[PDB]
RNA sequence: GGCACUAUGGGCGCAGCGUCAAUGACGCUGACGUUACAGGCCAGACAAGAAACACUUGUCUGAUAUAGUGCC
């Protein structure tokens, strides 16, 4: 359980640009195994990017790749690498890297996955998301349960944190996937359902935290009346 | 010349207890050499199968794994709310390496309706200059869920986007999100803005709307 | 390119020839002897080595692989 594997060196990148991944080997060592690069699209499923190969240092990629991207290890630093030059956006994916397990133990199967590096290309610029309340209209509460939320608006890249009354009232929250807009920024909303006998009793705020723009904004949402 | 690794099905809805069978097909022959990987969502892949029919470690009993000429097959003997991922096949027969493009797993529970709300824009966002309209679909079940917007009994197109939750954990169901865009002007150009739900769960389809300055 | 004939390890000495040294060491070259013993060469299949290829090792199957000399 101390075999781990711990990517880094993603972000954003222009069209064009180049980033170079890192994947970090503690409980084994580098040198004997091969090591492979898999990428995931966001929403799609896995991809295969590289290997090389242990004691010739033979390496192979992929048709989409061959070319722009480099595999390589430091035996010395028990870190392979991966260069990532002339970015294009359908690079866009988190990246893992991953262990091939002992010949006579797991065959080629890959044993051991890193956390995932995410790594957007674009030629857009970073943006913080605008926050605005979907408020509670409790001119209709039936089940007596109101449903309230925040619309977190056109931010550039992803992830967003919304948490809602710090980390207290987790439950019934809905947030949603983000949606790229046909302006090329993000947007999701997320929602909480609660009673709505509770509706100014208890005050409703909820927590964005978009740290690609260092912006930890807070909304409140409650409704206006006549 | 790669070898593609056809999996199929892209979707499997099964309820616990259901034996379960997901299969992929190498376009040329890879002997044994191949894998099968858990994922969940936000989570690296987990190891399940390798050499085509040996299961990985920690892996249960009731997985297991299977090979006829090129046609390899997962399956599970009887489903465990734990073994509710995307299920991949991998062919590490030759360079380039392959996978499937996945299966996704789902659970199958009692039909649940939709508890439609509405939302008009906010005042801030009006202050800026665009109008965000959004309606929501809550804690139902099946997936499948028409939303049609009327602005003035009139149907919309383009103007919307909708988003859809995984299913739960709890109750294992869905929740969707619609939003229709415009800028300030044309919101405040009409009165009547309306969002029209067909679901299984709904004998008739369910409507909600708002007026513009309605409070 | 074909055919024939001839040669092909390891020590151990012999010579020659080097390099650094500093008269030391170890290489390199012998159809130069000698020899317990045997190998050496090329390719394919299969296995194993922390091992997809490459590398190294083993087994199996073939013969090959070089050079030289003729003839065609």
């Known amino acids: 359980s101390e075999v781990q594997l711990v990517e880094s060196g993603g972000g954003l990148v222009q069209p064009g640009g180049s980033l170079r991944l890192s994947c970090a080997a503690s409980g084994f060592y580098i040198s004997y195994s091969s090591i492979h690069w898999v990428r995931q699209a966001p929403g799609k499923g896995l991809e295969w990017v590289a290997s090389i190969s242990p004691y010739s240092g033979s390496t192979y990629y992929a048709d989409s790749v061959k070319g722009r991207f480099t595999i390589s290890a430091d035996t010395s630093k028990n870190t392979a690498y991966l260069q990532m030059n002339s970015l294009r956006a359908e690079d866009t994916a988190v990246y893992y890297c991953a262990r091939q397990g002992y010949r006579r133990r797991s065959g080629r199967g890959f044993d051991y996955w890193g956390q995932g590096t995410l790594v957007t290309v674009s030629s857009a610029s970073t943006k913080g998301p605008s926050v605005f309340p979907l408020a509670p209209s409790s001119k209709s509460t039936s089940g007596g349960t109101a449903a309230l939320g925040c619309l977190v608006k056109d931010y550039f890249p992803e992830p967003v944190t919304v948490s809602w009354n710090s980390g207290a009232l987790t439950s019934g929250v809905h947030t949603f996937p983000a949606v790229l807009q046909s302006s090329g920024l993000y947007s999701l909303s997320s929602v909480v359902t609660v009673p709505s006998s509770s509706l100014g009793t208890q005050t409703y705020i909820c927590n964005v935290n978009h740290k690609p723009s260092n912006t930890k904004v807070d909304k409140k949402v409650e409704p206006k009346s006549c | 010349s790669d070898i593609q690794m056809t999996q199929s099905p892209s979707s499997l809805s099964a309820s616990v207890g259901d034996r379960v069978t997901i299969t992929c097909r190498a376009s040329?022959?890879?002997?044994?050499?191949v894998a099968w990987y858990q994922q969940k969502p936000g989570k690296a892949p987990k190891l399940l199968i390798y050499?085509?029919?040996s299961l990985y470690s920690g892996v249960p009993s009731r997985f297991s794994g299977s090979r006829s000429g090129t046609d390899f097959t997962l399956t599970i003997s009887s489903l465990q709310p734990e073994d509710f991922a995307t299920y991949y096949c991998?062919?590490?027969?030759?360079?380039?390496?392959?996978f499937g493009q996945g299966t996704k797993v789902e659970i199958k529970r009692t039909v649940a309706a939709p508890s439609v709300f509405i939302f008009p824009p906010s005042d801030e966002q009006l202050k800026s200059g665009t109008a965000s309209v959004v309606c929501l679909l809550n804690n139902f079940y099946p997936r499948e869920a028409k939303v049609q917007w009327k602005v003035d009994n009139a149907l919309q197109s383009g103007n919307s986007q909708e988003s859809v939750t995984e299913q739960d954990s709890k109750d294992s169901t869905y929740s969707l999100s619609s939003t229709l865009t415009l800028s300030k002007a044309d919101y405040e150009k009409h009165k009547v803005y309306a969002c029209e739900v067909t679901h299984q769960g709904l004998s008739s389809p369910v409507t909600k709307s708002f007026n513009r300055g309605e409070c």
């Open positions: 050499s085509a029919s």
């Open positions: 991998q062919q590490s027969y030759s360079f380039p390496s392959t």
């Open positions: 040329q022959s890879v002997s044994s050499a």
